[PDB]
Amino acid sequence: TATAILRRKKRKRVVRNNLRINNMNEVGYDDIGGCRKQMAQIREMVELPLRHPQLFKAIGIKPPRGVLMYGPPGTGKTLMARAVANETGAFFFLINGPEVMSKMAGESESNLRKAFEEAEKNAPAIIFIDEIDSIAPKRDKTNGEVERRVVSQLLTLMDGMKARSNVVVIAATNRPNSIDPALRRFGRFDREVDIGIPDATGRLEVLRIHTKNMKLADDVDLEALAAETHGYVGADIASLCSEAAMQQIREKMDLIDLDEDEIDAEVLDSLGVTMDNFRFALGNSNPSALRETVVESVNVTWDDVGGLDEIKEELKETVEYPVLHPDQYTKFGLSPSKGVLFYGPPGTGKTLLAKAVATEVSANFISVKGPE
Amino acid sequence: DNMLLVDDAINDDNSVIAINSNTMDKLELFRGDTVLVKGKKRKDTVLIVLIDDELEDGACRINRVVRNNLRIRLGDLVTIHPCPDIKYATRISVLPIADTIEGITGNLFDVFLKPYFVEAYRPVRKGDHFVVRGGMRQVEFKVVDVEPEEYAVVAQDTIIHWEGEPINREDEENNMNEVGYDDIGGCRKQMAQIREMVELPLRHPQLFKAIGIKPPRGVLMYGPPGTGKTLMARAVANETGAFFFLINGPEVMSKMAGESESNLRKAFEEAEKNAPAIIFIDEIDSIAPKRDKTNGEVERRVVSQLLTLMDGMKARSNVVVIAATNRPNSIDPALRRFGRFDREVDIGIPDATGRLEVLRIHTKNMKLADDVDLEALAAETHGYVGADIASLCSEAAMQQIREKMDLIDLDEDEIDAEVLDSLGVTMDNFRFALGNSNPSALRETVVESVNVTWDDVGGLDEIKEELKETVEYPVLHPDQYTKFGLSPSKGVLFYGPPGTGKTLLAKAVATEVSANFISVKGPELLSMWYGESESNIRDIFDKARAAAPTVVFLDELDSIAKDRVVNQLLTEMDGMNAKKNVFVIGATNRPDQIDPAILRPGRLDQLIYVPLPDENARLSILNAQLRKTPLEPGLELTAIAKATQGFSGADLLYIVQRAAKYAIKDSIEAHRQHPVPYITKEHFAEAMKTAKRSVSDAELRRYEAYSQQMKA
Amino acid sequence: MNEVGYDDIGGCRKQMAQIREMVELPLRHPQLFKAIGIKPPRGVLMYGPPGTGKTLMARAVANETGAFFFLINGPEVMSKMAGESESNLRKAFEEAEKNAPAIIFIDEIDSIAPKRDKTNGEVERRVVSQLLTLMDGMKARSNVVVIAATNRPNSIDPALRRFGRFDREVDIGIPDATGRLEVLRIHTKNMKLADDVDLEALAAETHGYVGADIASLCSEAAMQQIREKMDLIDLDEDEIDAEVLDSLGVTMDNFRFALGNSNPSALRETVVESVNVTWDDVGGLDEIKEELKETVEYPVLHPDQYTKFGLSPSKGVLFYGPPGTGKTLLAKAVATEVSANFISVKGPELLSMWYGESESNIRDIFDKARAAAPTVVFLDELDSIAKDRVVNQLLTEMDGMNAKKNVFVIGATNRPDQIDPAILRPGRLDQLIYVPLPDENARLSILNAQLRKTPLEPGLELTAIAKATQGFSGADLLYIVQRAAKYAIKDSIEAHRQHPVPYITKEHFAEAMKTAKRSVSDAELRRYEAYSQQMKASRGQ
Ligand SMILES: Nc1ncnc2c1ncn2[C@@H]1O[C@H](COP(=O)(O)OP(=O)(O)OP(=O)(O)O)[C@@H](O)[C@H]1O
Ligand SMILES: Nc1ncnc2c1ncn2[C@@H]1O[C@H](COP(=O)(O)OP(=O)(O)OP(=O)(O)O)[C@@H](O)[C@H]1O
Ligand SMILES: Nc1ncnc2c1ncn2[C@@H]1O[C@H](COP(=O)(O)OP(=O)(O)OP(=O)(O)O)[C@@H](O)[C@H]1O
Ligand SMILES: Nc1ncnc2c1ncn2[C@@H]1O[C@H](COP(=O)(O)OP(=O)(O)O)[C@@H](O)[C@H]1O
Ligand SMILES: Nc1ncnc2c1ncn2[C@@H]1O[C@H](COP(=O)(O)OP(=O)(O)O)[C@@H](O)[C@H]1O
Ligand SMILES: Nc1ncnc2c1ncn2[C@@H]1O[C@H](COP(=O)(O)OP(=O)(O)O)[C@@H](O)[C@H]1O
C-alpha cells in the first residue's frame, strides 16, 4: 500500500565506472529527490503493466494506460519521465510538442502515425509526448484547420491504441486546463499526477544531487541554504549553483590572465566555492514559480501560534477525525463537513491556523491570495 | 420440439449431440444423422445426432467446446433442425491455436489430427473449434477455411492444409467486439426503444409492406459521455446480425482535405450494396458541429457531404443510421428534421438497480473475496456512470495489488505462483477506490430517476392531494380529460421558507407517475445567464421532450427571475405540446421578486405555499432521518418535537448531525483512551444547547401575509 | 420516385395556383406572350417553414408541365472540391438552356448564397459571383424558369432579389383544418385503417402541424399498432404468420398516442397562418365590431369608392384595455371577414428580436406579410419594447409600405401611456380603440361559446353565474369553467375507482365559483377609464 514499490545501476575504479557505481543520460532514480510520492505513483502505473503483465491476467482487469503529469515548469517532469523510461528499459519513443509542430503542413500527422505504429510493433513501449499542450491546446485557442487535424489524429490514435498491446502513453503539461478537454476521458489520459514545489527536505536533496561535483569549500552549510531557499524549484536551485560558481570564478579572476589561452594549473586547482558566493547567488536569483498557484507542503504545528485552544479543538474535531478515523464516520453514516470560514481582526494568524490544519492531516496546501 | 435442455456430454466428441429416444422420434431423425443447432445470438453449428435413452425428455448432451462455440452454458436452450444436405469438404485449411502449441514438436498434423480424422466424418463449419488429445497433451484447432462452404463433412477425400501462423487465442475477443444484450445493464427502456426501431425494419421487413408505411430511418442517441452509447449500438448491431459499419468522427475528421468526403461516400455506398446494414456514426458532433463553432471551408464541406449522403438514402431501404453525441444543441440544426434523424433517444445516469447490474457485469472475471456487499456499493455510489464504475473496479484491483506488493519482489520476470493464487479484493479496496473516484456526470444537467414515495414527506397532506389531482389524473387517465376536452395544467410553483422539503416533494411527484426527473439548480441558471455554461435552456427542454414523461425542477428561480434567460424559458414553455407530459415545477423564496410574466395562465401559475412542518411533521422527519443510525433504546422524540417549534427540516437535520458528531467524538476519544454504539439522549441535549432556528420571524410573517393576500 | 402530380398535394390551392399560373403559361403557351408582347418573369422564390412541401410542389409542377427538368441541391453543390461548384453550376445551366423548355430548382439556395455577413470565406464569394453571373446571363436565354426554395426570405443574399432575378416571391404558410384533412387522406390511402377512424377529428385536433409532421404522425401511429400487435409476434421466427400479418390494423387510439408522442415546431417561429373566426366567438362590443368592419372591410371589398374619393385607408390600429378582453380573437375575426391571412408576433418574440438571438427579424416579418398579401400583422404587448432599435426598425418598416397593398398592423398593449408617442402619429398605429370588460349578456354569450364542446346537465341556467361575475374578464370565466370541469373529472375518477358522472352539474359550478377572483384590480380599471375619458376629451368636441 502507499509508496510500496520504492522499497527494495541503470541496468548496467574502472569496474566501478563501467558499472556506474556531456550526454550522460539514463539518469536513474538516484538523480531525483524530493518527489517521492509522485515518483512512486509513476513507477507503480508504468512498471507493473510492462515488467509484470501477468498479474492483471491473474486478477482479470484492464490496466489504465493514459498518464498525465502536470506542474509548474522546471519541476523536472522531463527528468522523471526519462528516468522512468531508462529504468524500465523498454522501447522508448520520444515525441516533443514544438518539434512536431515545426514540420510542414501535412507532415506533423504522419509522424504521429508512424510513431504509434512503431511503438505498437516493438512492444513493450513507452511514449512520452512532451509538451502535449503545443499539439493540443484549448479548443478556443486554435481555429486553424491544421490545429484541429493534429488533435483529431492524436485522439484517433489514442483510442485505437487501447488494446492488449503493452504500450503506455505519458504526457506533460504545465497547465492542466490548457489541454483539450476531450483528451481527459475514459480510455485516454485519465490518471493525473500533480508535481508540486519541494519542501526543505526536497530542496536539500536537490542541492546535494547538483552539488556533488563542484569544488565546494569546507565552509559550506547546505542545510542553511535549504532552509533559506523557499519556493525554489529544482531548476532555480541548479541556476543558483551555477551563479555561485560563476561568482567564485569572477572573484578569482584577479590572478587569471585572460589574454593567455591557458592558465596556471595551481590557479585552476585552487577554485573553491564559499558560502558568501552562495549568498550572493541567492541575492541575484529570482524564482517565478510562486507567480502562479502551486502545491506545497507545510510544517506548522500547534506551537508557533498562541492561545485559541477552543478554536484548535474545534478545527481538530472538524478535520482530523474525518481523516484519521473515517471508519467511525461511516459507522455513524455522517459525512464530514466540507469547508470552514475564519473571521476576525486582521493579523490574528489565520494563515498559520490553516497551515497547522494542513500539517496535522499531512495534506498539501494550496493558497489563493487576494491579488489572485 | 426443437427446443431441448442442455446437458454435459460424457464423451469427448465436439461434433456429437445426444438426444432422447422419444425426442429423436419427435424430431424424426436417425442415429448418426447430422443436425444443425443454433444457440444464443447468431452462432450455430452442426453436430452428429446420437441416441441416448438415459437423456430425459426434452434434453440433450453437448460438451464444453460446443457450449463455448454457441456462447451458451449448461441448461440453456437451442434450436435443432435436420441437416441431411451437409456435403463433404473437398479442401479445408485449419491452423492450431498458439497457446495450444507451446513447445509441442513433431508433425502436429499426423500426431493429432490424423487419429482424429481417420474416417471420423465429423461435421465442420466456418469458425468452429475442436480439441484433440494426443499423447499426454491436448491441442485445439479452428476451422480457418473450408470448400465447399459453409458447413460440410471432413471425410478421407478432404485435403487438409495445416500450414499457417498459429491462431493466438487472445485476439479472438481482444481485437473483436462480440457483445450481446447480456453485456448491457441498467438501461432497458432505451434498449427496447432502439430495438423496436432497428430490428423490426430489418428482421421483419414485410410487416411495413403489409401495413404500407415507410419506417423511420435516422436515429439520434445522446446523453452524458461514458454511458455506453457506443456499447449499446454495438450490441444492437451484433444481435440484429445484419452487416455493421462504423464511421468514427475524429477518424473521418483527421485526414487530408478532400479525403474525408471520400471516406464517407465509400462507407455509405458499401452499406448500400450490402442491404440490410447498420451505419453507426460515433461522435457526430465532431464532424457536424454547430455553425458558430466551425467556419472553415473544409469543416462545412464535410457537413454538406454528410447531408447529401443522408438525404440520398431515404429511397433505398434496409439501412438505418445511428448517431451519438453529448448534447442535442451540439450539432448543426439542419440534421434534426424530417428524413434526417427523426427519432431521438436520451440516455441518463442509471439507478441503484442499474448500478448493481453494471457491477455484476463488470465483476464477473475479477477474483472478489467472499465479503463483498455489491448492494451496499450500489446504494453508496450515486451519480456514477458505467465508465466511472469500471474505473472504480480497476482502482480497487490496483489497490489490492499494491497491498499484495509487500510479499513480492520487483526483480525477475516471473512471480511466485502462491502469491498469484492469493489475489482477492476486499471491501476496503472498494471503499478506497470510491474515495479516489472522480465522477463528473453531475457537473452538467442529466436525466435520472427517483424512488421517493409519499413516505418521507411529513405533513402538508392537502398539498399532496392537490399535487395528485394536478399530476396523476392527466397522465394515468387522459381519457376523462379528452371526454371533457380539458387540456391539463402544465406546471406548478412552490413558494415558502427554504429547506421545507420542496426538492423531495418534486421528486415524489415525479415518482408517482413513474417519470424521469431533471434538475436545474441556481448555479446552473447563473452559468447559463453569463453564457459560460455548456448547456442551454433549449437543450434542457429538448432532453425533457426526448425522455418524456419528465419533471423539470427549477430550484431558486428568483436568482434569475428578478431578461435573456427568462425570455428563453418563457419561449420554451410556450412552445410546448399539450399532450406531452412534461411538467415544470419551480421553487423560490421571494415570490414577490419573481417576474409576473411567468405567473400568467398556461405557465407556472398554480402557486403553492409550503408551510413550516408541524409537530407531527417534525416527528416524522426525525423518525425518517434517524432510520439508519443506532439510537439509544427508549428515546422519546415528542419532547424534541414540542421544543423544536419554528424549526425547518434542515434545522432538524443539523441538530441530528451535531448530536451524531458529539457521539462519535465521545466514542473516538474513549477508543483512543484504550464501547459507544448508541447515541444517548444527552447527545441530543448537547446538540440542542447550541442549536437554533435559521428562519427569522419577520420572514415567516411576511410569507404568511403574502399567502393571506393571495387567498383574499 | 416521380410522377407526383397535383393529386399528391392538398390544402395549398392558393400557392399552387400562383406557381402554376406563373410557370405553365411561359412554357405551355409561349405564343401568348408573343401576342401580347410582354416579357414573362423568370425568377421564382418560394420560401416558408421547413417540411411544408416546397420541393414536392416544384416536382409536381415540373412533372405536370411535362418539360425537361433539372434538380440542383445546395448541399451537394457546396460539397464538391474547390473550383468544382462553379463547373457544376455552369454545366447544369448550359444543359437546361440546351433542352428548352426547361425548369431549374435550386433547392436550399440559402446554403450556397447565404447572407453576406456569413460569407467571410473566399469560396463563398466565388460561388455567389458565379451564380449571379449565370442568372444575369440567362436573360438572353428563354423558355427557362428558375425556382428556388429557402427557409426564410432574409437568409439569401439581397443581391438575388432584384429585377431579372428571383423577383416573384411565394410564401408557404401552415395549412388549416381542410388542408390537414386533405393531407391525412392523401397519406392514408394505403394503410389498413380500421373502420373506427375519425380522420376529421384528427384534423380538428392537430393544429399547427406541417405536412411532414402529419406524415410522421401517421408513421408513428402505424408503429404503435405494430408494437401493440407484436404480442402475437416472436422475433425468433423468420417467417411471419399470414393470419397475424393480415390481422394488423390501425385504430383511433393509435393516432391519439401518436399525437401524444409528437414534436411540432412550425409555430416556434412566426409563420403565416389562416384563421376562420367569425362574429360569434366574441360577444358584445357591437360598436367596436361595426367600427372595425367599416375601417377594414370597405377598403378591401370596395376600393372603388375610396378611389372615387381618393381616401387612403388607414394602415394599422391599436387596441388598449384590461388584459384578457379578447383582443386577439377580435383581430382574428377582423382578418377572417376580409379573407386575409394572419401573422402573430408575441412579446417574447419581440424581446428575442431585441436581443438578436432569434433567426427572424422585423424586416423578414413584413416581407412575408407583403408576399402573403392581404394579411393582418398582430403585434402583442408592445409595451415590453416601447418601454429603441426595435421601435426604430418597426417605424421604418411601417412607413415604407405600399398604400395599395392590404397590410394592416394591429397592436395590443395594456400601457398606452408608456407607448412611445412616435408610434401614434398619423400614418401609423394612430387609431386607438378601448376594449372594455364584457357585459352581462357578453358574459353569458362567452360562457355558452366555451361550453359548446362540453356536455351539460339540462336545466343548468348560467344567468345566475353571469350576474355573479361583474367585472370578470373572459380569462376569469374560462378559469371558472375549467375548474368546474376539473372538479367534475375528479368526482368521476373517484367514482370509477370506487367502482356514473357523465356530465357537469350545477353543484360543480357552484364549487368552482366559490373560489373565484377578479383578475383586474379596481385601481387598474380606474386608471384605464380615466385614460379613456382623457382621450375622449382629446377628440370629443
Ligand atoms: N529532483 C529534481 N527536481 C527538479 N529538478 C531537478 C531535479 N533533479 C535535477 N533537476 C534539474 O532541474 C531541471 C529540470 O529540467 P527539466 O527539463 O526536467 O524540466 P521541465 O520543466 O520538467 O521540462 P520540460 O521542458 O520538458 O517541460 C534540470 O536542471 C535538472 O537538472
Ligand atoms: N450498461 C452500461 N452502461 C454504461 N457503461 C457500460 C455498460 N455496460 C458496460 N459499460 C462499460 O462502460 C464503458 C462505456 O464505454 P464507451 O466508450 O462504450 O461509452 P460511451 O459513452 O457510449 O462512448 P463514446 O461516447 O466515447 O463513444 C465501457 O467500459 C463499457 O464496458
Ligand atoms: N400537400 C402536402 N404538403 C406538404 N407535404 C406533403 C403534402 N403531401 C405529402 N407531403 C409530405 O410531406 C413531406 C414534405 O417534405 P418536403 O421535402 O417536400 O418538404 P420541404 O421542406 O419543402 O423540402 P426541402 O427543404 O428538403 O426541399 C414529404 O413527406 C411529402 O411526402
Ligand atoms: N498567534 C498569533 N497571533 C497573531 N499573529 C501571529 C500569531 N503567530 C504568528 N503571527 C504573525 O502573524 C503574521 C501573519 O498574520 P495572518 O493573520 O496569518 O495573516 P493576515 O495578517 O493577512 O490575516 C505573521 O507574520 C506571523 O509572524
Ligand atoms: N417533508 C419534509 N419537509 C421538510 N424537510 C424535510 C422533509 N423531509 C425531509 N426533510 C429534511 O429537511 C431538509 C430540508 O432541505 P431540502 O428540502 O433538501 O431543501 P429545499 O426545501 O430548499 O428544497 C431535507 O434535506 C431533509 O433532510
Ligand atoms: N367576448 C370576449 N371577451 C373577453 N374574452 C373572451 C371573449 N370571447 C372569448 N374570450 C376568451 O379570451 C381569451 C383570450 O384572451 P386575450 O384577450 O387574448 O388575452 P390578452 O388580453 O392577454 O391578449 C380566450 O381564451 C377566450 O376564451
Q: Quick one: which of C487, C484, C489 has its CA closest to C502?
A: C489
B114 touches B105 (CB < 8 A) = no
* Closest Cα in chain B, distance from residue A107 (Å): 11
d(CA B640, CA B622) in angstroms, rounded, equals 9
Between the CA of C446 and the centroid of ligand 6 the distance, in Å, is 9
Q: According to the 3-state scheme, what is the secondary structure of B74-90?
A: CCCEEEEEECCCCEECC
Neighbouring C-beta atoms of residue B674, cutoff 10 Å: 5
Q: Counting atoms of ligand 6 from 1, which one is nearest the CA of B600?
A: 22
Are C245 and B545 within 8 A, CB to CB?
Answer: no
Q: Kindly report the three-state secondary structure assignment for every residue of C187-220.
A: HCCCCCECCCCCHHHHHHHCCCCCHHHHHHHHHH
Q: B311-347 b/e with 16+ CB inside 10 Å = b? A: bbbeeebbbbbbbbbbbbbbbbebbbebbbbbbbbbb
CA–CA separation, C345 and C399 (whole Å): 19
* Ligand 6 pocket, residues with Cβ under 6 angstroms: C 281-284, 323-329, 412, 438, 442, 446, 450, 473-475, 478
Residues just before a chain gap in chain A (C–N exceeding 2.5 Å) are 8, 12, 21
Is B300 an interface residue toward C (CB < 8 Å)?
yes
* Amino acid occupying residue C297: E
Phi, psi for residue C145 in degrees, rounded to 5? -125, 135
Q: Are B441 and B383 in contact (CB under 8 A)?
A: yes
Q: Which three cell numbers stand for residue C5?
A: 402530380
3-state secondary structure chain A: CCCCCCCCCCCCCHHHHHHCCCCCCCCCHHHCCCCHHHHHHHHHHHHHHHHCCHHHHHHCCCCCCCEEEECCCCCCHHHHHHHHHHHHCCEEEEEEHHHHHCCCCCCCCHHHHHHHHHHHHCCCEEEEEECHHHHCCCCCCCCCHHHHHHHHHHHHHHHHHCCCCCEEEEEECCCCCCCCHHHCCCCCCCEEEECCCCCHHHHHHHHHHHCCCCCECCCCCHHHHHHHCCCCCHHHHHHHHHHHHHHHHHHHHHHCCCCCCCCCHHHHHCCCECHHHHHHHHHHCCCCHHHCCCCECCCCCCCCCCCCHHHHHHHHHHHHHHHHCHHHHHHHCCCCCCCCCCCCCCCCCHHHHHHHHHHHCCCCECCCCCCC
**Exposed/middle/buried for residue A147 (C-beta within 10 Å: 0-12, 13-18, 19+):** middle
Rounded distance between C-alpha atoms, residue B212 and residue B23, angstroms? 42
Q: Quick check: B258 contacting C, CB < 8 Å?
A: yes
Pick the closest to residue B294 from B281, B304, B307, B282 (CA basis).
B304
Check: CB of residue C269 under 8 Å from CB of residue C360. yes
In the structure grid, which three cell numbers stand for residue B92, read together? 479445408
For the record, the C-alpha cell of C167 comes out as: 423577383
CA–CA separation, A145 vs B429, rounded Å?
Answer: 46
* E strand segments, C392-530: 407-413, 431-434
Q: Does B368 touch chain A (CB under 8 A)?
A: no
Q: Is the Cβ of B444 closer than 8 Å to some Cβ of chain A?
A: no
Secondary structure of B531-549 as H, E, C letters: CCCCCCHHHHHHHHHHCCC
Report whether C438 contacts C474 (CB < 8 A). Answer: yes
Residue of B nearest to C224 (CA): B196
Tell me the angle at which helices C362-371 and C389-399 cross, rounded to the nearest 10 degrees. 20
Residue B216 touches chain C, beta carbons under 8 Å: yes
Compute φ and ψ for B15, nearest 5 degrees. Answer: -120, 30
Residue B210 CA to its chain's centroid (Å): 34
Residues contacting residue C42 through CB under 8 Å, at least 6 positions apart: C138, C139, C144, C145, C146, C164
- Tell me the three state secondary structure of residue B368: strand
Distance from C-alpha of B45 to C-alpha of B15, rounded to nearest angstrom: 9
Instruction: Please enumerate in sequence order all residues whose Cβ is within 8 A of that of B509, keeping only pairs 6 or more positions apart, or say none.
Output: B467, B471, B551, B583, B585
Nearest CA to ligand 5 atom 12: B649
> Which of B79, B214, B575 lies closest to C219 in CB terms?
B214
- B394 touches C at CB < 8 Å: no
Euclidean distance between CA atoms C359 and A356, whole angstroms: 58
Please tell me which of the candidates A4, A54, A149 has its beta carbon nearest to residue B402.
A4
User: Whose CA is closest to A276, among A234, A233, A216, A227?
Assistant: A216
Q: Which of C227, C346, C351 sits opposite B196 (nearest CB)?
A: C227
DSSP characters for B292-344? TT--SHHHHHHHHHHHHHHHTTSSS-SEEEEEEES-GGGS-GGGSBTTBS-EE
The Cα angle at residue B698 between residues B692 and B702, in degrees rounded to 5? 130
The DSSP element (H or E) to which B279 belongs, if any, is: strand B277-281
Q: What Å distances lie between residue C495 and B53, B426, C451, C455, CA to CA?
A: 63, 57, 24, 18
Half-sphere exposure for C270 (CA within 13 Å, toward CB): 31
Q: Please give the order of strands across the beta sheet that includes B319-325.
A: B243-246, B277-281, B319-325, B219-222, B343-346
CB C8 within 8 A of CB C29: no
Gap between the Cα atoms of A9 and A21, Å rounded: 7
Give the number of the ligand closest to the Cα of residue A370.
4
- Give all chains having 3 or more CB-to-CB distances under 8 Å with chain C: B
Q: How many CA atoms lie within 13 A of C164 on its CB side?
A: 11
B358 lines ligand 2 (CB under 6 A): yes
* B&C contacts, CB < 8 Å: 137
Atom of ligand 4 nearest to the CA of A351: 18
CA distance B617 to C320: 50
Report whether C454 contacts C300 (CB < 8 A). Answer: no
Residues lining ligand 4, CB < 6 A? A 305-306, 346-352
Phi, psi of B600 (to 5 degrees): -75, 160
Report whether residue C149 contacts ligand 3, using a CB cutoff of 6 Å.
yes
Tell me phi and psi for residue B564, to 5 degrees: -60, -50
Radius of gyration for chain A, computed over Cα atoms and rounded to the nearest angstrom: 25
Determine how many CB atoms are found less than 10 A away from the CB of residue B602.
Answer: 13
Counting beta carbons within 10 angstroms of the beta carbon of residue A128, is it exposed (0 to 12), middle (13 to 18) or buried (19 or more)?
A: buried
What are residue C195's phi and psi, to 5 degrees? -60, -30
Q: Which helix (H) or strand (E) holds B377?
A: helix B374-380
Paired strand residues for C150: C47
Q: How far is CA B140 from CA B14, B97, B154, C540, in A?
A: 11, 6, 16, 109
Closest residue in C to B201 (Cα) is: C223
CA distance C361 to chain B (A): 16
Minimal-distance CA residue to ligand 5 atom 21: B499
Which residue(s) pair with A367 in the sheet? none
C245 close to B (CB below 8 A)? yes
Query: How far, in Å, is the centroid of ligand 2 from the Cα of B221?
Result: 13
Query: Known binder of ligand: residue A339?
Result: no
- Ligand 4 atom with the shortest distance to the CA of A305: 1
Q: State yes or no: C387 annotated in a binding site.
A: no
Q: Measured between alpha carbons, how far is C41 from C135 in angstroms, rounded to an integer? A: 13
Distance CA B45, CA C181 (A): 55
> CA-based angle A186:A187:A191, to the nearest 5?
70
**Any C CB within 8 A of B485 CB:** yes
Within 8 A by CB and 6+ apart from B335, the residues are B220, B284, B288, B306, B307, B310, B341
C-alpha to C-alpha distance for B53 and B35, rounded to whole angstroms = 18
B501 known ligand binder: yes
CA dist C68 and C143 (Å) reads: 11
Q: Report cis status (omega within 30 of 0) of the bond before A124.
A: yes
**By what technique were these coordinates determined?**
cryo-EM
| Pairwise CA distance, residues B223 & B448, whole Å | 11
Q: For residue B159, give the 3-state DSSP assignment.
A: strand
Alpha helices per DSSP H over C261-388: 286-292, 298-301, 303-309, 327-337, 347-355, 362-371
C4 CB near ligand 3 (under 6 Å): no
Of residues C423, C465, C460, C433, the one with CA closest to residue C446: C465
Give yes or no for a contact between B125 and B45, defined as CB atoms under 8 angstroms apart. Answer: yes
The answer to whether chain A touches chain C by having 3 or more C-beta pairs less than 8 angstroms apart is no
The one-character DSSP state at B553 is E
A174 is in an annotated binding site: yes
CB B44 within 8 A of CB B241: no
Q: What are the φ and ψ backbone dihedral angles of A171, each rounded to 5 degrees?
A: -130, 150
The cell for B366 is 475479477
Q: How far is the centre of ligand 1, averaged over its atoms, from the C-alpha of A100 (Å)?
A: 21
Q: What is the resolution of the experimental data for this entry, in Å? A: 3.8
Q: What angle do CA C475, C476, C482 make, to 5 degrees?
A: 85
Using CB atoms within 10 Å of the CB of residue C511, give its burial: 0 to 12 exposed, 13 to 18 middle, 19+ buried: middle
The amino acid at C500: P
Per the listing, cell 384533412 goes with: C181
Tell me whether residue A73 is annotated as binding: yes
Integer Cα distance of C313 and C401 in angstroms: 13
Output the CA angle C183-C186-C191, nearest 5 degrees: 120
Task: Count the Cβ atoms, other than its own, within 10 Å of residue A181.
Answer: 10
| Position A76, amino acid | G
Q: How far is CA B533 from the centre of its chain?
A: 26
Cα-trace Rg, chain C: 28
Phi, psi of C172 (to 5 degrees): -105, 115
Per the listing, cell 392558393 goes with C14
Contact A61, B393 (CB under 8 A): yes
Q: Which amino acid is at C430?
A: D
- Tell me the three cell numbers of residue B77: 436452450
Phi, psi of B268, rounded to the nearest 5 degrees:
-65, -45
- Specify the 3-state DSSP secondary structure of B243: strand
| Exposure string over C436-466, b if 16+ CB within 10 A, otherwise e | bbbeeebbbbbbebbeeebeeeeeeebeebb
Nearest one of A297, A292, A290 to A364, comparing CA atoms: A297
Q: How far is the CA of B358 from the centre of ligand 2 (A)?
A: 10
Cα of B338 from ligand 3 centre, angstroms: 9
Chain B residues in contact with C359 (beta carbon < 8 A): none
* Cell matching residue B220: 439520434
Rg (CA), chain B: 33
Contacts of B43 (CB under 8 A, 6+ apart): B69, B70, B71
State the cell numbers at A201: 527536505
C-alpha–C-alpha distance, residues B240 and B246, integer Å: 15
